[PDB]
């Protein structure tokens, strides 16, 4: 009864499909969704959205940003910037970007904006390291 | 601020003893005659069918047809708390034998049926779930003491509410005077607030005891 609209600018995953549970990493806490959830909305963060349909199938969809909205009519609208299954990802690439991000942090110096970008890429790299190694 | 009095729980104050105070809810039972019910029958039927629907989420297979006992226990508790607050009626729930009848036979019913049916699960209820070895034995012994004396505290709970409720009302009444209008109005208004509290707690205490027995008959 939980309508799922997990889409992306690249791909489209679900369209009004009944899902038993979707766990979303948001800025308001990496909480989870069940049918007839709390009417709320939150902002996505780099992490592993998971899909648990009516058959209990576990699917992992790493995203990089986005939005999550749950309305009062048990309608779930999760839109993410680039949602991919995590199986087509590399932990070695995750640490390579993470090491590159650490270099950006160390070489930022007085460039506070570049320091923020290094911190942002650090969060993305650490998210993918846990995503790919799990 | 004057004085106080107690001892409203004498079963044999007269040769027509106070055992008739337990036979008063038989009057209030809605005996049904016509096909289309009357106003109080429909109200009682709607309330009971409402409670049966609410308890249907917590029934389970082991209490497949024991909901009649739970509802009858609910109506007995309610009519032994509501009737205990009317003035010239001795407090039946203050007598421990009523509370002994309320808790002890049904608890022995539920613990022996659990022991015969699911013996290992009954012993596993005496341990917190996922308890490691060094944390095991003291939790087991205390929860053994807990599950042995928990219904005894249920009987105490049903007694203590009406004992404390009736002690408070008798205290407020005895510290007032008929002649003084100010004191009488203060006493009356204080009892009205206290009765609203005591009526509310009496219904809620009956509701929670139905809920507790429905949970403990499900297992």
């Amino acid at each position: 009864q939980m309508a799922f609209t997990f889409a992306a600018p690249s791909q489209v995953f679900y369209n009004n499909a009944n899902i038993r549970q979707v766990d979303v990493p948001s800025f308001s806490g990496s909480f989870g969704i069940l049918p007839a959830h709390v009417a709320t909305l939150a902002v996505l963060k780099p992490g592993v959205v998971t899909v648990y349909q009516e058959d209990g199938s576990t699917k992992k969809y790493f995203v990089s940003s986005g939005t999550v909205t749950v309305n009062d009519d048990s309608s779930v609208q999760v839109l993410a910037e680039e949602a991919v299954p995590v199986e087509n990802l590399d932990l070695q690439a995750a640490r390579d970007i993470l090491s590159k991000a650490q270099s950006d942090v160390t070489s930022a110096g007085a460039d506070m904006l570049k320091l923020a970008e290094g911190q942002i890429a650090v969060e993305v790299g650490e998210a993918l390291v846990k995503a790919a190694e799990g | 601020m004057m004085a106080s009095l107690f001892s409203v729980f004498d079963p044999t104050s007269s040769f027509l003893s106070n055992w008739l105070s337990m036979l008063i809810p038989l009057l209030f039972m809605v005996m049904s005659f016509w096909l289309i019910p009357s106003r109080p029958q429909f109200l009682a039927k709607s309330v009971l069918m409402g409670l049966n629907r609410e308890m249907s989420l917590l029934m389970g297979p082991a209490s497949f047809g024991a909901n009649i006992l739970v509802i009858a226990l609910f109506l007995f508790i309610l009519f032994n708390n509501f009737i205990g607050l009317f003035p010239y009626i001795f407090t039946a729930t203050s007598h421990l034998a009523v509370t002994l009848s309320l808790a002890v036979p049904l608890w022995i019913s539920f613990i022996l049926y659990t022991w015969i049916k699911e013996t290992t699960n009954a012993l596993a209820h005496l341990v917190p779930l996922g308890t490691p070895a060094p944390l095991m034995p003291f939790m087991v012994l205390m929860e053994i003491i807990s599950n042995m004396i928990r219904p005894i505290t249920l009987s105490v709970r049903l007694a203590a509410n009406m004992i404390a409720g009736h002690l408070l009302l008798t205290l407020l009444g005895a510290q007032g005077t008929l002649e003084n209008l100010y004191v009488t109005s203060i006493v009356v208004f204080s009892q009205i607030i206290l009765l609203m509290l005591e009526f509310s707690v009496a219904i809620i205490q009956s509701y929670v005891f139905m809920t507790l027995m429905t949970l403990y008959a499900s297992e």
């Binding site: 690249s10 940003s65 087509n88 690439a93 993918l128 | -």
Partner: protein, 37 residues
């Protein structure tokens, strides 16, 4: 947060977040997903 504290828009954060995601798409899907403009 750090992004708002450094006065960086969330859209700029989105583009940095998606570029780092795309750079970890080594085997086959890096060129197919990135169509530039």
């Amino acid at each position: 947060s750090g992004r708002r504290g450094r006065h960086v828009d969330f859209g700029a954060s989105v583009d940095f977040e998606v570029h780092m995601m795309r750079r970890a798409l080594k085997p086959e899907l890096r060129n197919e997903a990135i169509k530039r403009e």
